């Protein structure tokens, strides 16, 4: 769980770049997922390309007991609660007829438990289907076809994808009869009517006051299994844009929020939303120093092949997340009326494995 901390840290820095390029647009993203796929990529890279990835990420995949820690981490996040509620996948695709380095395919399999996929990219259509069917089969058909694979052509040599789906039942369900339509106050001051769920309960809560004096509501919603939680953060005042918060956001801060919470009764009103985002990882990664890997005759992929040059043609994350009411002796009812928190303005959410600290999901909702 030294790995869980560094991955989330790297993953949240990537989210930050994605948010800064999509102001006033919804985004859902996976810090764990981008960290996971880049770990795999480290093993195919060498020289200055490998150093660029390792300096951003804060660790090397070759180091003793690091690939086994990722595998242990994987199973702790997914073993908990399965079914069609959570779903994840990483894959690298390389041109089929390249001579690969001796012993690489077996070596990759020992560390990660899967192959580097080999496909004939000159069979353009075939290769599009193979890459879309990989995502489709492995996410139980919950995510729509990748857009970015339209760039895939005869000259394409290397492609990496990551895809996740999440739809959790809560620890305590939202009572359904309190679900209705309410005005949501967009960042440009206009409103839209949207369905919002409502629940009275004891919640883990804290205020967060940034250094300029604007204060925020930080609220925790545990999922069933008592293992994962969704964190909700929103400035109180509508005048404070959410970029003030995403620009100073880190994996560590989210832990400080948690570490300083208390159980208090509230009546929470939260939008019912669904969100799907395809993210092209090129520019976010470039901004964190990983420039060489995308560039012809700069990229050093000599660990995967020393017969021919390679470079990443396309690097994509696609995530989809659902947020609804569903959940799963002596419960005593409120005598007094609880204080209210209404999330009817753009807000941040984080999904967090509390034991490890892993940030599974992160996003901004500018219009639910």
């Amino acid at each position, epitope marked *: 769980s030294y790995v869980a901390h560094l991955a989330s840290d790297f993953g949240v820095r990537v989210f930050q770049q994605v948010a800064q390029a999509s102001k006033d647009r919804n985004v859902v993203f996976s810090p764990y997922g981008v960290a996971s796929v880049l770990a795999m990529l480290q093993l195919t890279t*060498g*020289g*200055e*390309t490998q150093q660029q990835i390792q300096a951003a990420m804060g660790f090397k995949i070759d180091d003793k007991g690091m690939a086994p820690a990722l595998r242990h981490l994987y199973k702790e996040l997914m073993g908990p609660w399965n079914k069609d509620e959570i779903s994840t996948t990483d894959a690298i695709f390389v041109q089929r007829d390249l001579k690969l380095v001796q012993g690489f395919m077996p070596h990759f399999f020992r560390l990660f438990r899967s192959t580097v996929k080999q496909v004939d990219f000159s069979e353009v259509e075939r290769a599009r289907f193979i890459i879309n069917d990989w995502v489709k089969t492995h996410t139980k058909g919950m995510i729509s076809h990748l857009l970015g694979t339209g760039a895939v052509d005869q*000259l394409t040599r290397l492609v990496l994808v990551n895809a996740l789906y999440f739809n959790g039942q809560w620890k305590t369900p939202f009572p359904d009869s309190s679900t209705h339509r309410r005005l949501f106050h967009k960042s440009d001051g206009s409103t839209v009517s949207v369905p919002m769920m409502a629940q009275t309960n004891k919640f883990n809560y804290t205020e967060f006051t940034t250094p300029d004096g604007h204060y925020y509501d930080i609220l925790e919603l545990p999922y069933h299994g008592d293992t994962l939680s969704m964190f909700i953060a929103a400035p109180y005042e509508k005048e404070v844009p959410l970029s003030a918060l995403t620009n100073i956001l880190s994996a560590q801060l989210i832990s400080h929020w948690k570490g300083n919470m208390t159980r208090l009764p509230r009546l929470l009103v939260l939008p019912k939303f669904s969100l799907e985002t395809e993210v092209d990882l090129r520019k976010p990664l470039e901004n964190l120093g990983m420039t*060489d890997m995308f*560039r*012809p*005759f*700069q*990229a*050093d*992929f*000599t660990s995967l*092949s*020393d*017969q*021919e*040059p390679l470079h990443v043609a396309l690097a994509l994350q696609k995530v989809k997340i659902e947020v609804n009411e569903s959940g799963t002796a002596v419960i005593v009812s409120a005598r007094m009326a609880p204080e209210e928190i209404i999330i009817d303005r753009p807000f941040l959410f984080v999904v967090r494995h509390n034991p490890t600290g892993t940030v599974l999901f992160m996003g901004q909702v500018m219009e639910p």
Partner: nanobody
Amino acid sequence: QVQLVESGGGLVQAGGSLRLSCAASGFTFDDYSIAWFRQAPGKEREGVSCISSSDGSAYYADSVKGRFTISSDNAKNTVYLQMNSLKPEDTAVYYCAAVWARVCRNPYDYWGQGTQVTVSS
């Protein structure tokens, strides 16, 4: 003592052809992987062509689409880039580079000073 020096820059009409050259003193190209790069106005330097020492094979950037030929003349210790069907978009400063490795990859051992190429329509 190792110096790479390019020649063949100049003005060319759109559709015209142009040949660039790079002589190597103090070593032989047939051990090193060789690559031509270029930088256009308002842009970062980008790879264009590569010869891998691994097996002699030639490679190109997507923007070439089979228009350009990189070659190595063992007797002359000279690298060539033959450029066909030039475009306004092909205007840039062109640089040659060499590295002791089986493929073209950063960082390179040796760089030429660079030659100007201008495709005026």
